[PDB]
């Protein structure tokens, strides 16, 4: 019943709230990876900063959905932000593989939201996803995949020297 | 039969002309609101300037459709620009409510044009609407809705002090 | 068993993790208040930005605890970030009263952590709380209290004009 | 009997002199590490400079205690500065492990001095230690621990290439 609401389906409004939660979940997972690589017994500070940066960008992705919801006359509904799946992340390769999986999970949710927006004939929402989310996902997935290839090339997980070199030359 | 024409349906060409007319109609309505708020017995000059600005932007929306028509090899066909629905606009709240309705009418026509472009499999026209029109509409509808909420908060139409304060602090 | 760990009690390590969670909880509550005041039917954008800023600062408070934990050789353990207590915040006065209560809750947890640090004879942790947290809390509590006094002075919740004026002149 | 003396216990005065000596001892140990890494048969010049810098900072820590003693009306009493425990330091890993142990020894003495100051109800001395010494210690201990983790990762002591890489990329 919002005075601004036009062509905005209840299903899309709800899916936007769920997507917001997933962005926050991703932010929290990256913050966990940051803290892990900052441990004195891990100590890969450029890797830590990479994940800290990713955490910040996910928070921005979430805020943009909040703003979107209000612009369309939907109502932001928040849920708990679940803690990350792991408390420790093994090493740079394990963490990067988890990040790849996470970005693909986020991407799948965005693609699913686009399918819903398409089904409900909401071109504004489709454009929003295409212009603000989908290409960012493809770029990040590619960058993380490239990193994984290099970490394998460097002999991870066994090759500690390789891991050191990655932190010094790749991030 | 234009040498440049490719994948441009006659129905879309005609609908673009009708949309151009509606943009001009919106421009003219906003110019009327400008003149009303500039009256010596109304005298809300920041509100007047707000509507003058909106009138100018609608004229730009119209010109962009003219350019689009020619780019696709369609032919601009003009019709009369109908005078606005009212000669006087009551007060800032009444005018803002009319502006909201007008922007939603324009938005509906743009969404309908997008449906037609989709039906005729014209991705260039769909992209044009999404990239140049649809988000501008959502932004303006949100801004005007926010204004209406504040005008009600300020006690319009009865509260003259509230109306004065809005002109001095909101526009 | 961290090589860096010295004079850092397990109880303090655990309490630092709980404090980190509370900072994140506060951040999330402020983000909810931001989204509420950005609603088209609320539309107090300076109030919204005030709460957005507070949300960002709470996230920084959390990150500083993460860094602290690692510096002392403790281990960051994350838990779910609970959703805020309310989905809607009434008006500027209600939200400010909730913010005051929240800041006092955060302050009490910091004071309790200081008591624990004192009990465990950890002057580094005591200094950290005193130099980085306790004065920030006193300042914010005072600012929010001052706001509440002014909102009451302005006739909240009934006086919509008062609420408008606060958003334009106080934040 | 100094005219400036107020709330300064004889025990604290004596403990400040002992602490001054320990700072000088640490400076001398770091100067030894500098000279070792500057040897033509060791030749890790960035590691050498790291330890030279640490030596200079310990001398500054000592001078600040001298100034403190006089400010409180205590009297500086100097003792011999004992030569370092070793004449040669093995390699970067061995030296870093010795540095970690040294910084923890210095930290323990500072914490013990804080306990004494607390017992004698000397908040000025407590504040001095907290504001000028304790956080510097935590920072340096963390940095050295991080280095040790990386040196182990790089295969020290056996991996000469790892040792070379550390000197070129970590210090
Ligand atoms: Cl709708
Ligand atoms: Cl529609
Ligand atoms: Cl929902
Ligand atoms: Cl785990
Ligand atoms: Cl995942
Ligand atoms: Cl054609
Ligand atoms: Cl075609
Ligand atoms: Cl036509
Ligand atoms: Cl009329
Ligand atoms: Cl209309
Ligand atoms: Cl300990
Ligand atoms: Cl101790
Ligand atoms: Cl814990
Ligand atoms: Cl609620
Ligand atoms: Cl609370
Ligand atoms: Cl005395
Ligand atoms: Cl005294
Ligand atoms: Cl002495
Ligand atoms: Cl020796
Ligand atoms: Cl030692
Ligand atoms: Fe990312
Ligand atoms: Fe994201
Ligand atoms: Fe992401
Ligand atoms: Fe990215
Ligand atoms: Fe407009
Ligand atoms: Fe328009
Ligand atoms: Fe418009
Ligand atoms: Fe506009
Ligand atoms: Fe705050
Ligand atoms: Fe906080
Ligand atoms: Fe706070
Ligand atoms: Fe603050
Ligand atoms: Fe040092
Ligand atoms: Fe020192
Ligand atoms: Fe030191
Ligand atoms: Fe240092
Ligand atoms: Mg619904
Ligand atoms: Mg979910
Ligand atoms: Mg759970
Ligand atoms: Mg389609
Ligand atoms: Mg597009
Ligand atoms: Mg793009
Ligand atoms: Mg690349
Ligand atoms: Mg035709
Ligand atoms: Mg028409
Ligand atoms: Mg007529
Ligand atoms: Mg766009
Ligand atoms: Mg706005
Ligand atoms: Mg424990
Ligand atoms: Mg808690
Ligand atoms: Mg719950
Ligand atoms: Mg104290
Ligand atoms: Mg302070
Ligand atoms: Mg003040
Ligand atoms: Mg004496
Ligand atoms: Mg001694
Ligand atoms: Mg001797
Ligand atoms: Mg300090
Ligand atoms: Mg560091």
Curated annotation (Swiss-Prot), chains A, B, C, D:
Gene Ontology terms, cellular component aspect?
A: cytoplasm
EC annotation from Swiss-Prot or TrEMBL: 1.16.3.1
User: What reaction does this enzyme carry out catalytically?
Assistant: 4 Fe(2+) + O2 + 4 H(+) = 4 Fe(3+) + 2 H2O
Q: Which GO terms describe its biological process?
A: intracellular iron ion homeostasis; iron ion transport
* Residues that coordinate or bind Fe cation 1: 23, 58, 61
By its UniProt entry, which SUPFAM superfamilies does this protein fall under? Ferritin-like (SSF47240)
Record-linked Pfam families: Ferritin
PANTHER family registered for this protein in UniProt? FERRITIN
Q: How does it assemble?
A: Oligomer of 24 subunits. The functional molecule is roughly spherical and contains a central cavity into which the polymeric mineral iron core is deposited.
Which family does the record claim for this protein? Belongs to the ferritin family.
Q: Please tell me what else the database record remarks about this protein.
A: There are three types of ferritin subunits in amphibia: L, M and H chains. M and H chains are fast mineralizing; the L chain is very slow mineralizing.
What is the purpose of this protein?
Stores iron in a soluble, non-toxic, readily available form. Important for iron homeostasis. Has ferroxidase activity. Iron is taken up in the ferrous form and deposited as ferric hydroxides after oxidation.
Protein name per its UniProtKB record? Ferritin, middle subunit
Natural source organism: Aquarana catesbeiana
Question: Source organism lineage?
Answer: Eukaryota, Metazoa, Chordata, Craniata, Vertebrata
């Amino acid at each position: 019943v919002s005075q601004v609401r036009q062509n905005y389906h209840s299903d899309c409004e709800a899916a936007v709230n769920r997507m917001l939660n997933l962005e926050l979940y991703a932010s929290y997972t990256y913050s966990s990876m940051y803290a892990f690589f900052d441990r004195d017994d891990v100590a890969l500070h450029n890797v830590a900063e990479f994940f800290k940066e990713h955490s910040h960008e996910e928070r921005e992705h979430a805020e943009k959905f909040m703003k979107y919801q209000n612009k369309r006359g939907g109502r932001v509904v928040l849920q708990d932000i679940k803690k990350p799946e792991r408390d420790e992340w093994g090493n740079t390769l394990e963490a990067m593989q988890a990040a790849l999986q996470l970005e693909k999970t986020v991407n799948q949710a965005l693609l699913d939201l686009h399918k819903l927006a398409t089904d409900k004939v909401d071109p504004h929402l489709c454009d929003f996803l295409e212009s603000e989310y989908l290409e960012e996902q493809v770029k990040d997935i590619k960058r993380i995949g490239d990193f994984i290839t290099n970490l394998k090339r460097l002999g991870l997980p066994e090759n500690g020297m390789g891991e050191y070199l990655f932190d010094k030359h790749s991030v």
